[PDB]
Amino acid sequence: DIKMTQSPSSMYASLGERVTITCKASQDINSYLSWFQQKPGKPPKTLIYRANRLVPGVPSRFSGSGSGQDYSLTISSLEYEDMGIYWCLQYDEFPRTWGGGTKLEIKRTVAAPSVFIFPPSDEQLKSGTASVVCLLNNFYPREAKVQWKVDNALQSGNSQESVTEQDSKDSTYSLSSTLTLSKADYEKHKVYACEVTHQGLSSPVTKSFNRGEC
Amino acid sequence: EVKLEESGGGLVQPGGSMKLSCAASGFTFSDAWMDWVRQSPEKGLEWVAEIGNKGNNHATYYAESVKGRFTVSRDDSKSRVYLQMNSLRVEDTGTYYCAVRFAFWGQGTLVTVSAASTKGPSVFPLAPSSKSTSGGTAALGCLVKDYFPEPVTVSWNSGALTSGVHTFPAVLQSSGLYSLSSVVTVPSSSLGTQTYICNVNHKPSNTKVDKRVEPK
Numbered sequence: 135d136i137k138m139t140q141s142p143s144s145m146y147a148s149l150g151e152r153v154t155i156t157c158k159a160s161q162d163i164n165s166y167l168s169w170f171q172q173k174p175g176k177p178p179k180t181l182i183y184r185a186n187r188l189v190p191g192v193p194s195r196f197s198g199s200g201s202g203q204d205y206s207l208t209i210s211s212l213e214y215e216d217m218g219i220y221w222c223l224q225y226d227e228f229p230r231t232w233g234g235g236t237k238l239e240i241k242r243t244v245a246a247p248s249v250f251i252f253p254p255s256d257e258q259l260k261s262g263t264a265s266v267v268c269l270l271n272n273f274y275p276r277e278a279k280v281q282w283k284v285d286n287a288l289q290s291g292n293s294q295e296s297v298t299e300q301d302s303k304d305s306t307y308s309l310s311s312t313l314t315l316s317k318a319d320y321e322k323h324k325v326y327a328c329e330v331t332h333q334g335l336s337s338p339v340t341k342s343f344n345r346g347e348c
Numbered sequence: 349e350v351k352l353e354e355s356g357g358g359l360v361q362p363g364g365s366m367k368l369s370c371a372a373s374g375f376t377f378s379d380a381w382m383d384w385v386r387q388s389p390e391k392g393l394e395w396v397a398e399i400g401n402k403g404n405n406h407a408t409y410y411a412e413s414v415k416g417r418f419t420v421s422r423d424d425s426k427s428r429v430y431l432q433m434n435s436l437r438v439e440d441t442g443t444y445y446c447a448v449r450f451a452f453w454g455q456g457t458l459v460t461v462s463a464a465s466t467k468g469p470s471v472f473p474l475a476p477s478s479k480s481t482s483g484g485t486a487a488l489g490c491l492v493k494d495y496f497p498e499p500v501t502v503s504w505n506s507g508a509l510t511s512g513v514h515t516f517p518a519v520l521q522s523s524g525l526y527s528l529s530s531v532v533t534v535p536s537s538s539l540g541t542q543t544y545i546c547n548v549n550h551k552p553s554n555t556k557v558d559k560r561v562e563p564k
């Protein structure tokens with residue numbers, strides 16, 4: 135199989151900047167190389183085929199270059215809609231093989247998150263589990279740390295989190311973390327706290343509630 | 349305009365079979381060679397199968413991972429390409445796309461190979477906090493817990509509220525069920541006067557829920 139390697143795996147660029155990303159094959163692929171853009175939850179969209187041929191309807195700021203093993207895609211001047219994941223495909227031989235993708239995101243100013251904590255609902259407690267949720271709203275850059283504490287005991291291994299992407303409406307990230315406890319354990323403790331560390335905060339921010347207090 | 353539309357996906361048990369179909373329009377179908385490509389978080393994009401046009405007598409080609417189990421075929425009179433998948437494996441899970449000449453793509457169809465049963469979600473409120481004081485911004489949401497398989501969608505106020513909404517990627521819990529949250533930020537001063545309803549759809553279980561979220 136022909137191995138396709140893309141670089142960088144991810145990067146940021148500012149509005150209007152020139153962007154060049156690379157795709158290298160483990161042998162000469164005779165310019166049978168295509169480039170694609172993909173947005174979250176959506177199919178690939180073909181940009182360029184045979185290394186340098188633009189698909190009709192693709193803006194001319196996109197161009198492709200290279201031969202042999204080494205190929206590149208250039209965005210001459212980045213537009214906001216160009217965020218997404220860029221993939222390359224070789225179709226010189228079978229199997230057709232893909233690169234691992236390059237994620238392209240847009241630079242913007244630092245933003246500290248606003249933080250919110252949510253107790254488990256009475257409706258959920260009826261059935262034996264408690265989910266405590268911590269929201270980090272609209273922050274940049276993406277690196278953020280959530281630490282959960284229950285009566286000052288650091289929780290580890292009992293939370294999961296996920297993060298939103300930039301899109302047409304948002305250039306910041308948001309993050310949701312869920313701490314899961316049994317109802318029995320939830321009712322044994324009082325102070326539920328989410329502590330957030332982020333570069334935009336002078337010091338970590340803690341949001342907390344006391345179980346059973348309005 | 350070229351259009352492609354895949355159908356036939358859903359949940360199927362390991363060792364089972366499933367047939368995908370791709371309906372095409374907007375090009376001369378019999379002259380086009382076609383491919384199936386699948387995608388997962390774990391493996392990225394993977395080419396699955398190709399079927400030629402008349403120029404190579406509709407030659408077919410397969411990824412080694414699916415050879416002997418999958419069959420690509422076409423019906424030119426129907427402008428359809430098909431993928432018959434037998435002896436399915438967990439690692440065959442993914443979003444399956446049909447493409448014409450690697451140039452135009454369908455929207456994809458999600459194939460989940462799992463022994464687990466379909467389960468609709470419970471929807472719990474993430475209620476706006478009583479501490480607040482107004483002239484500020486409050487957050488509220490819905491926790492869509494314990495469903496299988498993906499996906500779920502969430503809207504607010506039947507689509508009338510979109511600014512400030514964040515609907516997060518689901519997490520797979522150790523139980524094997526997914527959980528997802530959706531939140532919105534709104535003026536704290538609005539909490540006594542505005543109604544907020546999350547509209548949750550889990551099509552795999554035919555489950556729809558509208559959950560009003562109120563303080564306290």
Ligand SMILES: CC(=O)N[C@@H]1[C@@H](O[C@@H]2O[C@H](CO)[C@H](O)[C@H](O[C@]3(C(=O)O)C[C@H](O)[C@@H](NC(C)=O)[C@H]([C@H](O)[C@H](O)CO)O3)[C@H]2O)[C@H](O[C@@H]2O[C@@H](C)[C@@H](O)[C@@H](O)[C@@H]2O)[C@@H](CO)O[C@H]1O
Binds near residue numbers: 379380
């Ligand atoms: C147009 C067509 O279907 N021609 C087939 C021929 O397929 C072509 O083979 C060439 C070989 O140089 C190449 O692989 C063509 O692929 C691309 C291209 O890079 O040119 C792929 C692009 O995504 C596509 N772009 C768009 C917008 O559609 C272009 C485009 O169709 C053509 O450039 C227009 O002329 O095509 C490919 O289309 C086919 O050749 C066989 O199958 C190929 C996939 C490849 O494996 C060849 O080695 C193989 O001989 C022949 C035989 O079935 O039939 C022609 O009709």
